[PDB]
Structure 1
Amino acid sequence: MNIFEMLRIDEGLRLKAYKDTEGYYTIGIGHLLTKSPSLNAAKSELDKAIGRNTNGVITKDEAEKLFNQDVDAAVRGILRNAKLKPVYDSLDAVRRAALINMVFQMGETGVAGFTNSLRMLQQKRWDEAAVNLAKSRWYNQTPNRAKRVITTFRTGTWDAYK
């Protein structure tokens, strides 16, 4: 198991523009296209991202291509971020994967916001950080996924995913 596999399970794979759990236009493996309630705006972004006249649909290859880009941007975003980097640096491999997952989903800014949890993670207080993570809009809105990510942090294993 690895990050790609992990995120592929959490996000799914849709080749046709759909709306996310917050109603935003997304496509592929959780690739956000736009917040804007407009499908054309969606289609526009989409063609702009793929580089062709898509008509709201992409191929698997395409989908995977956006995913590679996004996973890469998420890692680099963490390593760039003053608040995240040290957390990341302090973590073992499995847990790093959990942090990347949160970053892929909510953005670096969103995550940089779990100040308290971050600190707990850095201090290796697993159970406490898990509890704290749960007190969030995130957990409340996407509780199942949130639980898998939270368990991964708590345990340092991939059990939540097997």
Structure 2
Amino acid sequence: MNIFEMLRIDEGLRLKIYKDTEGYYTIGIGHLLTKSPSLNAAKSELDKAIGRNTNGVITKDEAEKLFNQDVDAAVRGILRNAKLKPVYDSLDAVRRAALINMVFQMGETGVAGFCNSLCMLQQKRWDEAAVNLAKSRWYNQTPNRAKRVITTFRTGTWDAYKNL
């Protein structure tokens, strides 16, 4: 297992514009197009992202291209963030993937919101972090995904992602 396989499990793959769990227009492997209510606004973002007239539909290779970019950007975002970098640097490889997964979902700003949990992770208090992570809108809104990421932080293994 690796970050790519992990996110493909959590996000799925869809080749037509769809609305995510928050109702925002999305395509591919969780690539957010826009928070605007307008389908036209989303189609225009899509075309600009892909570099062609797509009419709301993309290929598998295009989806994977967006995904590669988005994972690289989340990794580079963590490494330039003064709050996140010291946490990521402290973690083992499996737990680093869990942090990337959170940043991919909710952005840098949203994760820097979890400062209590981040301080517990940096100190390697895994059971305590896992409890604090769950007291969040994130856990309440997407509990099955949150539980997989939290389990990965608690254990430092890929066990939540094997068998599905």
| Band the TM-score falls in, shorter-chain normalisation | over 0.9
SS at match of 2:102: helix
SS at match of 2:18: strand
- What TM-score do you get using the length of structure 1 for normalisation? 1.00
Deviations 1:87-124 (A, max 9, x none): 00000000000000000000011001100000000000
How far did residue 32 of structure 1 move?
A: 0.1
- What TM-score do you get using the length of structure 2 for normalisation? 0.99
2: CA distance between counterparts of 1:96 and 1:112? 15
Q: Gaps (5+ residues) in structure 2?
A: none
How far did residue 61 of structure 1 move?
A: 0.2
SS at match of 1:18: strand
Matched, 1:118 2:118: yes
Q: Gaps (5+ residues) in structure 1?
A: none
2: CA distance between counterparts of 1:156 and 1:25? 33
How far did residue 130 of structure 1 move?
A: 0.2
Determine the structure 2 residue equivalent to 1:30.
30
How far did residue 14 of structure 1 move?
A: 0.3
State the superposition RMSD in angstroms: 0.2
Determine the structure 2 residue equivalent to 1:153.
153
How far did residue 80 of structure 1 move?
A: 0.3
Name the % identity. 98
How far did residue 24 of structure 1 move?
A: 0.1
How far did residue 145 of structure 1 move?
A: 0.2
Determine the structure 1 residue equivalent to 2:3.
3
Determine the structure 2 residue equivalent to 1:84.
84
How far did residue 33 of structure 1 move?
A: 0.2
2: CA distance between counterparts of 1:150 and 1:91? 14
Point out 4+ residue stretches in structure 1 off by more than 3 angstroms: none
2: CA distance between counterparts of 1:38 and 1:71? 26
How far did residue 31 of structure 1 move?
A: 0.1
How far did residue 62 of structure 1 move?
A: 0.1
Determine the structure 2 residue equivalent to 1:45.
45
How far did residue 85 of structure 1 move?
A: 0.2
Determine the structure 1 residue equivalent to 2:109.
109
Deviations 1:32-53 (A, max 9, x none): 0000010000000000000000
2: CA distance between counterparts of 1:97 and 1:26? 22
Deviations 1:26-75 (A, max 9, x none): 00000000000100000000000000000000000000000000000000
1: CA distance between counterparts of 2:127 and 2:60? 39
SS at match of 1:102: helix
2: CA distance between counterparts of 1:115 and 1:6? 24
How far did residue 151 of structure 1 move?
A: 0.1
